[PDB]
Design an enzyme around this catalytic site. Structure first.
Site, PDB file in Angstrom:
ATOM      1  CD  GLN B  11      -2.332   1.299   2.837  1.00 39.99           C
ATOM      2  OE1 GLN B  11      -2.386   0.275   3.520  1.00 39.99           O
ATOM      3  NE2 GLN B  11      -2.895   2.441   3.214  1.00 39.99           N
ATOM      4  CD  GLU B  72      -5.151  -2.851   1.693  1.00 31.60           C
ATOM      5  OE1 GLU B  72      -3.978  -2.982   2.105  1.00 31.60           O
ATOM      6  OE2 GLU B  72      -5.918  -1.953   2.098  1.00 31.60           O
ATOM      7  CB  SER B 141       6.254   0.373   3.723  1.00 27.22           C
ATOM      8  OG  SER B 141       5.182  -0.465   4.121  1.00 27.22           O
ATOM      9  N   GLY B 145       3.816  -5.631   5.902  1.00 25.36           N
ATOM     10  CA  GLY B 145       4.609  -6.836   5.733  1.00 25.36           C
ATOM     11  C   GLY B 145       4.408  -7.510   4.392  1.00 25.36           C
ATOM     12  CB  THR B 146       1.476  -7.807   2.138  1.00 23.34           C
ATOM     13  OG1 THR B 146       0.675  -8.599   3.024  1.00 23.34           O
ATOM     14  CG2 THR B 146       1.228  -8.253   0.705  1.00 23.34           C
ATOM     15  CG  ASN B 207       6.887   6.582   7.671  1.00 27.59           C
ATOM     16  OD1 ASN B 207       7.525   6.726   6.628  1.00 27.59           O
ATOM     17  ND2 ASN B 207       6.081   5.548   7.879  1.00 27.59           N
ATOM     18  CG  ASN B 229       3.189   8.815  -0.056  1.00 31.06           C
ATOM     19  OD1 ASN B 229       3.954   8.144   0.637  1.00 31.06           O
ATOM     20  ND2 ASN B 229       1.877   8.616  -0.073  1.00 31.06           N
ATOM     21  CD  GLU B 255      31.543   5.363 -11.256  1.00 36.25           C
ATOM     22  OE1 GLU B 255      31.699   4.543 -12.185  1.00 36.25           O
ATOM     23  OE2 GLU B 255      32.393   5.542 -10.358  1.00 36.25           O
TER      24      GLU B 255
END
Ligand code: GTP
Ligand code: GTP
EC number: 3.6.5.-
Lengths: 441, 440, 453
Positions: B11, B72, B141, B145-146, B207, B229, B255
């Site tokens: 997400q 999701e 992220s 966890g997904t 964050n 974002n 490089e």
């Protein structure tokens, strides 16, 4: 034969601006360095070589290097003379504006950036071959100026022992900052006893008074005194900038004026001049040159002991008045019985390429005297220093570098300066006695 | 070989990619709808982009080659509501029918590879469509966890597929104080395991620091995920500007990869960008790039919960966007050498990979930071991330000792040896960074 | 003894300096950016000679005898678009191998080895288009890894392919490197071949380039293009002795005869007064200098294009070419003054050499203050100082072996041990070169032939 001018401090920059303007007007060079004379006739009787470098453009760049810790005054002098001086002959130490009116900071600035000044003077000397000496323009009162002057004096004595070095130094007036300014002076004066081959003295109080006399407005600007100094320097160099038969070297002038290296401090006088009628004959010109109100230094003496006197009369003069004034002056001026009663007069030719000064056809005269009046101002300065030193230990608060690491060495250096100026004034007052040369008679 | 492929996982990764494409279209003067608008307009063509990220169709349409993968369906509907789905091809976005677990225990499991097969054949078809590739880009992220699991698995699969192109994985790191999911320590450790499997370059970002910057520098009362974002879009745009636009100092991505890794193993460099200030404050200040560099060295402009002043100095890269003066960067490196704050390693000391981009920086209007004509991005290696990993490992070891969720894990298909090896890998990376800091 | 010379552009810097040099030559010979001589082909009398560097297919067109070699087609396409019809498209080499995979010397060496057949075919074809050939002028751009590798490959091919041709080289060194290890390694690997095969090498340290571009130009920011303009003007001034042949030096071999004392000492130190054909050249008529001042500036460290490091430097072959209306008496005076101001090795009584060039009849005449310029080239050992710090880098990084995973690909050796051995051999070679240069600074160097016969 070539001479390089050294403008130290804002005072030096101002007097250099004024003197170079005066010389460009005399030699017809103007503020752009280009020859103001036509290219059809090359016959000239002056000598711009020792003071101006002529390039393929036939532009005369002033043979002068400006050294100062204040870039603003040098930038302003460049602005008023855009295209006249060489940007490479400019030295500001790249340290920003000035800071600290003590001799310590100035001498430390000189020691740190000595390599750049050495490279500059070496490049200037290598531009030609026949070199004779330098000209130093500084005020002993200015801290940075006096420090730079002493540093360059040390450099030129331990680097060029064959080049006679003369300087112009103006002592401050009776004011408040002397309590520290005198400090710098005596320190510079210390070097003036050791390395300075010649020195012309000035007193700012007498200069301001004489300017207020000759100028209508008593609010004398410092630029007016700078103009006066430029006039006196152009006058003493007239025999060099316009030689005909007799005097073609400053070495000869210092021969006829400086009898011994221990006595190389001369007092100038110049009269009459403007800064429009003629009412001063050469006889009157010389009797005014004798008058204290025409000397560029505070006399403060009833009968000064003249040792060696020499003058240059500018204008078309007949030898009859010359001899009359010479006889009268010999009847007036006293000489020691052990020394000679020498009096010499140089006929200084007028420049045909110079705009006519006010009071045309008015003969003028300059005189350089070696008497016990310079030592009177020296004694005044040394007494002020002794009072402010033995009475208050405040000089241990404004020091830089080696002088700031320990103040005891500063006290020792000041005591040694006092001792050497004491020995100098004692030698002077002994020269006033016939028993000075008793070792041979 | 000039093309670059980007991947949007989870997400947060999908939202970040949305913001990135928004800023991309905003810089090149392209509307979020398509056809065009406008161009391919001076110099939006060659030098690419927009043809490195925006594949040009026969009619001139520039489609961004991005894959939005997430199990999701809500995120898929969200990214479909935007006009970039119309800009995207329907085959580019991969819809997730059901979420694997909450959130990583099944994402990295066989249920992950079931859809990984589909996304890999899709990636193969896309590579057949557009030839050439400079590096693989990843956006996910650690909180989701997904996203982390699917991104790590896909990265491993593609590294086993090609392995010749660089891998740039953007991972959002959770704050050490707040844990929206108590499952996240385990997930982070198992993701460090997957990075030890394959990691060309990984970007760490917290964050918490970004929200603190929005509260302080952007004067935002409650920072939104949209602003975060947008800031990530800005930093990634500044990174890719060296290849997008022309510049006196254009540096290849490979490089960067080799410069960041002088040692046999370096995977995790920290990022920092400047300036990030308020719009009114941007109107109040007209500083040069030297002050921007001086501010970027501070821990404030790091956007991460790590202090570069604490950790030792390592090989770093300074990118500049907009009007740049050589005298300015010389004065900047002079002042940096005069700082003498952080300890320099023996190999690097006089090492600063200087990159220049002539294109001026550009910021979105929704962002409270006014667009600036000059920007400096410092990317450096530091040992403070080792301290953060050590704190996370302390928490994960406490949870492992409490063995409460290890039961649910072994129900999901996990083993004790797997978590033991992941802990060993994390401790090994921490000790490795400790040693390479000690070698200074 | 005069022959044609072909220019070799290697790397991005090489191509940029080649473009600038050919534009400068078109400015001097009135050829412009179109390849067609701006002068009408009806005037046959020409004091210059474009034939050694320009092939003439049509009477008004003079194709520059040069090959464009690089791995990045963008700069080649840009130079070709700016110089429409000026260069030959068949002499532009890119190999279509894409962008360089890093700044490794091994990458450039490999891309030159694999595509060696095509470049050798192009070189042979260009040799077929000429009759009297003498040698090449190679632009290394050793600051770049691919460029340095390509230059080393061309050198290793041309040393044994044409042993009867004199191969001069031009290596441009950077002032500061973002990753000093990689650039130092590339420069060391290129210098190995320079010592082995190269006949003449001119170094170009970017520190003095940046300093001069900041001094004489008005803009404080320094752009790479007008910096390459300096090197291009330098190369044009040195080639003037053939393009505008004088009466003393008329062949590159003759020029290198007084500049190469031995095949070991083949690295020179350049110097040049304030230029006149550069971008910001309006602040040159305010100098008011003479030929003696020009010689002083040539001997001044501020006008040297490389890191001076003047700590009592030993000179071996000091030479100068002066372009403009030169006076012989000023030359004699300058020689007298310099012989009193230049350190010479006591084992050789050979002093500095002075040459005078001619100004082009179509170049813009400058005022009488900077109407005459001059170039100076001095064989000095201080050049090894430019490498010394570099070797220092080696000497402080080779104990660990960083960036080794990048020099293993492309070259013939993928193992770490073989690459390490090759780097150690290159370090030994440059060490022996520095030892030769420091031994030449002593009188025992020449006494070695006296102690044994
Ligand atoms: N007659 C005259 N004297 C000056 C002039 N300017 C400075 N002076 C002398 O300089 C003294 C003051 O010191 P400064 O000129 O400021 O020298 P400094 O203390 O080293 O400070 P800086 O010159 O700024 O470095 C005064 O006593 C004057 O005698 C001037 O324009 N005319
Ligand atoms: N002074 C100057 N140096 C340059 C210029 N162009 C390239 N260089 C040098 O070259 C180095 C960068 O490498 P490149 O010349 O681009 O060689 P490369 O990395 O292999 O790239 P390509 O030559 O295009 O294949 C820099 O460190 C510069 O020192 C230039 O225009 N001026």
């Amino acid at each position: 034969g070539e001479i390089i001018t050294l403008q130290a401090g804002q005072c030096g920059n101002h007097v250099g601006k004024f003197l170079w303007s005066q010389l460009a007007k005399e030699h017809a060079i103007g503020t752009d360095g280009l020859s103001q004379l036509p290219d059809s006739s090359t016959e000239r009787d002056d000598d711009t070589k020792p003071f101006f470098r002529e390039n393929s453009r036939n532009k005369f760049t002033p043979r002068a290097i400006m050294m100062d810790s204040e870039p603003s005054v040098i930038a302003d002098v460049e602005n008023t003379f855009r295209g006249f001086f060489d940007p490479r002959n400019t030295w500001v130490a790249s340290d920003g504006a000035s800071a600290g009116n003590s001799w310590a900071n100035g001498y430390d600035i000189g020691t740190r950036n000595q390599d750049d000044i050495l490279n500059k003077i070496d490049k200037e000397i290598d531009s030609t071959d026949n070199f004779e000496g330098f000209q130093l323009l500084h005020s002993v009162a200015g801290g940075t100026g006096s420090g730079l002057g002493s540093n360059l004096l040390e450099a030129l004595c331990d680097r060029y022992p064959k080049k006679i070095l003369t300087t112009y130094s103006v002592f401050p007036a009776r004011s408040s900052e002397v309590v520290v300014q005198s400090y710098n002076t005596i320190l510079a004066l210390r070097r003036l006893i050791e390395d300075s081959d010649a020195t012309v003295v000035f007193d700012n109080a007498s200069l301001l008074n004489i300017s207020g006399k000759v100028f209508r407005n008593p609010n004398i600007d410092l630029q007016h005194t700078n103009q006066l100094i430029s006039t006196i320097i152009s006058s003493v160099t007239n025999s060099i900038r316009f030689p005909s038969y007799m005097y073609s070297s400053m070495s000869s002038i210092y021969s006829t004026l400086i009898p011994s290296p221990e006595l190389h401090f001369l007092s100038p006088s110049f009269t009459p001049f403007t800064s429009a009628h003629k009412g001063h004959s050469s006889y009157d010109v010389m009797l005014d040159l004798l008058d204290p109100s025409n000397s560029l230094v505070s006399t403060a003496m009833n009968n000064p002991t003249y040792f060696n006197v020499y003058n240059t009369i500018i204008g078309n003069v007949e030898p009859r008045q010359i001899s009359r004034a010479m006889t009268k002056l010999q009847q007036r001026i006293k000489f020691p019985s052990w020394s000679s009663s020498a009096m010499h007069v140089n006929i200084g030719r007028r420049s045909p390429y110079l705009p006519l000064q006010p009071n045309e056809n008015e003969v003028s005269g300059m005189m350089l005297s070696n008497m016990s009046t310079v030592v009177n101002v020296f004694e005044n300065a040394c007494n002020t220093f002794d009072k402010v030193f033995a009475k208050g230990a405040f000089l241990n608060n404004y020091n830089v570098g080696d002088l700031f690491q320990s103040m005891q060495n500063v006290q020792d250096e000041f005591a040694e300066s006092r001792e050497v100026v004491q020995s100098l004034m004692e030698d002077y007052v002994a020269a006033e006695q016939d028993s000075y040369l008793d070792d041979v008679l | 070989m000039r093309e670059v492929i980007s991947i949007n996982v989870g997400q947060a990764g999908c939202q970040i990619g949305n913001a990135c494409w928004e800023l991309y279209s905003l810089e090149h003067g392209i509307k979020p709808d398509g056809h065009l608008e406008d161009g391919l307009s001076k110099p939006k063509g060659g030098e690419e982009g927009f043809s490195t990220f925006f594949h040009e169709t026969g009619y001139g349409k520039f489609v961004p080659r991005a894959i939005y993968v997430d199990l999701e369906p809500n995120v898929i509907d969200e990214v479909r509501n935007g006009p970039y789905k119309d800009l995207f091809h329907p085959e580019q976005l991969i819809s997730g029918k059901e979420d694997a677990a909450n959130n990583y225990a099944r994402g990295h499991y066989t249920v992950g590879r079931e859809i990984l097969g589909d996304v890999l054949d899709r990636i193969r078809k896309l590579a057949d469509q557009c030839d050439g590739l400079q590096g693989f880009l990843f956006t996910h992220s650690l909180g989701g966890g997904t996203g982390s699991g699917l991104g790590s698995l896909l990265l491993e699969e593609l590294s086993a597929e090609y392995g010749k192109k660089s891998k740039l994985e953007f991972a959002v790191y959770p704050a050490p104080q707040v844990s929206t999911s108590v499952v996240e320590p385990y997930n982070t450790v198992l993701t460090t395991h997957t990075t030890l499997e394959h990691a060309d370059c990984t970007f760490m970002v917290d964050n918490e620091a970004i929200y603190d910057m929005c509260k302080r520098n952007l004067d935002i009362p409650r920072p939104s995920f949209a602003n975060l974002n947008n800031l990530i879009a800005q930093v990634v745009s500044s990174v890719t500007a060296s290849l997008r636009f022309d510049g006196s100092l254009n540096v290849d991505l490979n490089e960067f990869q080799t410069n960041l890794v002088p040692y046999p193993r370096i995977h995790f460099p920290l990022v920092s960008y400047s300036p990030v200030l308020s719009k009114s404050k941007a109107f109040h200040e007209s500083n040069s790039v030297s002050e921007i560099t001086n501010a970027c060295f501070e821990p404030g402009n790091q956007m991460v919960k790590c202090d570069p002043r604490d950790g030792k100095y390592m090989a770093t890269c300074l990118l500049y966007r907009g009007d740049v003066v050589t005298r300015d960067v010389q004065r900047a490196v002079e002042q940096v050498k005069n700082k003498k704050t952080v300890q320099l390693v023996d190999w690097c000391p006089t090492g600063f990979k200087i990159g220049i981009c002539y294109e001026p920086p550009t910021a979105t209007p929704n962002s409270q930071l006014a667009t600036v004509d000059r920007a400096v991005c410092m990317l450096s290696n530091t040992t403070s991330i080792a301290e953060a990993w050590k704190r996370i490992d302390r928490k994960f070891d406490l949870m492992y000792a409490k063995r409460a969720f290890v039961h649910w894990y072994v129900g999901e298909g996990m083993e004790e040896g797997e978590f033991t090896e992941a802990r060993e890998d994390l401790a090994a990376l921490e000790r490795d960074y400790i040693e390479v800091g000690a070698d200074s």
